[PDB]
Amino acid sequence: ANTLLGIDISSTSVKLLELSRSGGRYKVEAYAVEPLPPNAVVEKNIVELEGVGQALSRVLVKAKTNLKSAVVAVAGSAVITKTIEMEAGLSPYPLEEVAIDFEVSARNPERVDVLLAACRKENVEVREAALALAGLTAKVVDVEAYALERSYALLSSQLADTDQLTVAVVDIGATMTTLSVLHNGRTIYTREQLFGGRQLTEEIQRRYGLSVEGLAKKQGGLPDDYDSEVLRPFKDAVVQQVSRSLQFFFAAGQFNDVDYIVLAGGTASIQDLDRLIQQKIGTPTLVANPFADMALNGKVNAGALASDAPALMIACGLALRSFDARINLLPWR
Ligand SMILES: [Cl-]
Ligand SMILES: [Mg+2]
Ligand code: NA
């Protein structure tokens, strides 16, 4: 009966999500999004440990949750995910500094397929330390790619049956944008690039003489030229980026097109951004909403949650580890 907190640590904010399940129905018990100070996390690598710790503490109070066990994930250039084939029934740094986990051929039953995930131990230990500063304990250290898979299964209502489709998921962060293509529920392609919503926010800073503290993108209050000479060129830049990413996937595999394009991240909520992408690609594009078929707790604002929904895809997938191919990069004890 012990559930785990889904905690997504990005470059600009900490996202928490608590899930519960009863009678085959998921339920959002608690959630909160706490902003991180600048340069506290760079490219999903924790730089300022104390800063992340205090943000984790505040996101616990803001979410009003009493849980102390959490699921976190690692990502970046220090994280590897592969699929290796080897004989059945066997008995970045020197392995001594690498955290390794494995999980058990389709064509041939003489050999065996094994999923492999690895990273430097430092990336695990620091995240354990960050949780410790908030009084939290890591039960599962996962990989963001697999977390995206679990949250993707919750999008069957928004799409048919996700187990038969080829869907390109575009997670647009602030500094990083990730294209993940899922075939029949499993990831077959992944490509991260240095591009995100920071390009838009900074443009609003230098042109209208505003500070970094982002607020104008949500509430508004910008002059009438913003829609034409600022937001539109940025949306076109996002379109070109997504278009370029898809062309790389098509040239890498046997696929020439995808069935759907799912947008994730905070930047995915921009008005008609899904339409501009759908216009260019010619493929049905929708904003991710993993809370469509879920019940809701009383202390959770339905409106605020709906706005943050596509940005909570990673945090949602991490929280789904509370209920039973799974990876844990934590050392066995
Ligand atoms: Cl390990
Ligand atoms: Mg995000
Ligand atoms: Na809340």
Side-chain angles (χ1 to χ4, degrees), residues 78 92-94 98-100 119 123:
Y93 318 160
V98 181
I100 305 179
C119 66
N123 294 337

Side-chain angles (χ1 to χ4, degrees), residues 86 88-89 91-94 98-101 104-106 108-109 113 115-119 123-160 162 165-183 185 187-190 194-202 205-209 211 213-214 216 220-221 223-239 241-243 245-253 255 257-276:
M86 37 177 166
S91 180
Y93 318 160
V98 181
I100 305 179
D101 189 29
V104 178
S105 80
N108 174 359
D113 276 24
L115 189 67
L116 179 61
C119 66
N123 294 337
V124 178
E125 295 169 349
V126 167
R127 274 172 169 81
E128 288 187 85
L131 292 178
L133 289 173
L136 298 169
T137 304
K139 298 299 180 180
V140 170
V141 172
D142 210 334
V143 181
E144 287 192 359
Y146 302 147
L148 187 58
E149 292 189 6
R150 307 187 197 95
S151 55
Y152 163 77
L154 309 171
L155 303 179
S156 183
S157 173
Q158 211 168 2
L159 300 180
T162 63
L165 297 177
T166 302
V167 175
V169 177
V170 182
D171 197 335
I172 312 178
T175 62
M176 290 180 55
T177 300
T178 310
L179 173 69
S180 302
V181 184
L182 292 82
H183 184 50
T187 303
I188 62 177
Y189 183 81
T190 304
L194 296 179
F195 173 81
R198 178 177 288 186
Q199 182 66 258
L200 175 62
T201 59
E202 290 183 351
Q205 298 177 26
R206 83 163 195 176
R207 197 183 195 94
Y208 301 135
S211 57
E213 326 88 45
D224 294 82
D225 58 330
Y226 166 79
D227 207 326
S228 60
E229 76 192 31
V230 180
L231 183 59
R232 185 69 182 193
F234 171 75
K235 293 196 301 179
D236 293 333
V238 175
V239 162
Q241 157 67 12
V242 173
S243 179
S245 296
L246 288 180
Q247 296 302 313
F248 276 113
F249 162 67
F250 298 152
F255 288 91
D257 64 270
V258 293
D259 302 282
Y260 296 94
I261 299 181
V262 173
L263 301 183
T267 316
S269 300
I270 296 182
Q271 188 68 41
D272 294 332
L273 178 59
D274 56 336
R275 284 192 47 82
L276 263 61

Side-chain angles (χ1 to χ4, degrees), residues 8 10 12-13 15 44 171-174 264-267 310-314:
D8 179 30
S10 62
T12 55
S13 65
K15 307 176 184 62
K44 302 187 180 304
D171 197 335
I172 312 178
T267 316
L312 294 175
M313 283 291 291
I314 302 299

Side-chain angles (χ1 to χ4, degrees), residues 31 62-63 299-300:
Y31 102 99
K62 188 179 181 180
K299 69 171 180 295
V300 176

